[PDB]
Design a protein around this nucleic acid. Sequence first.
DNA 1: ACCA
Lengths: 5, 336
Amino acid sequence: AXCXX
Amino acid sequence: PVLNLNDPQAVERYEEFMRQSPYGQVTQDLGWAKVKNNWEPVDVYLEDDQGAIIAAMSMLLGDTPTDKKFAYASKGPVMDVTDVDLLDRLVDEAVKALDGRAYVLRFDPEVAYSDEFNTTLQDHGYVTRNRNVADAGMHATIQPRLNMVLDLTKFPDAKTTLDLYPSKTKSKIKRPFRDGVEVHSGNSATELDEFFKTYTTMAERHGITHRPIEYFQRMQAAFDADTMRIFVAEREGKLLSTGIALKYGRKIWYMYAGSMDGNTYYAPYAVQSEMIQWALDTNTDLYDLGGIESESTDDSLYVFKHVFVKDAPREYIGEIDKVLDPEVYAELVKDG
DNA sequence: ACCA
């Protein structure tokens, strides 16, 4: 959840 | 048409379109479904009158707290999304393939935000998520909308990373190498283990969430060393910093990274210099350092990436939502 | 200091 990717 | 993933000839035709398109994205490659192995893949495409593929959309379906799936085409579709009449036709094919199972189809292509484009998408019935949700920060959208992208086509004669930069930045980039930092790269289990040690250390230092090693093993299995490359910075046999870059379409993308605790001698700048060098050596148009929260010195991501990107960050159109079940959409998505 |  945190940088996407 | 819908792609039959069990048909290797169709799959290879789909992949050749993906790999050769100027709109291609690693997260639209079918290899990305192998990374996201907890999602369900559904892939569609359109053909021209000669039967050649002209547009494709790779979707991954995820669960929700409702009876509906979330359908997501990360950084897709692969076509000119400003050609909205063609976009509508591809989205219609995707919607057929979803067969009522999803409440939304979301796609977030790397196309600049503009008022005219936002208005056209809304005119065509899409729900867009961009400046209207900006207050929620970087994670208002799944991928960051603001991205720090180095346009190498502005420097057609550059041979090395230093050729891209003013003297003051040349000095910053030279400094790790002057102090003994050396970078190697590869896509073997050895470099993956080195990356993972720095990645977990970074995550624990920041108290943030981090992916299991099997995620990156699936990535390494899906993509060869001409696509995925892990860059590892050391100083006299001491591991300092790493980063994973993916080369696909018009860009090389700095996607994951980490540094050990302690003195790292600006090793992350050496990692950047070598990924940029990889972009130069392969005549790649763009080097993407990825997201920032805001164009502000208060943002540590912006400060770091501004060392390498002096142009303004690119601001994308954000999330484009084809709403399919509007009741569940309003339950699960807030429009800011 | 963060350099993800």
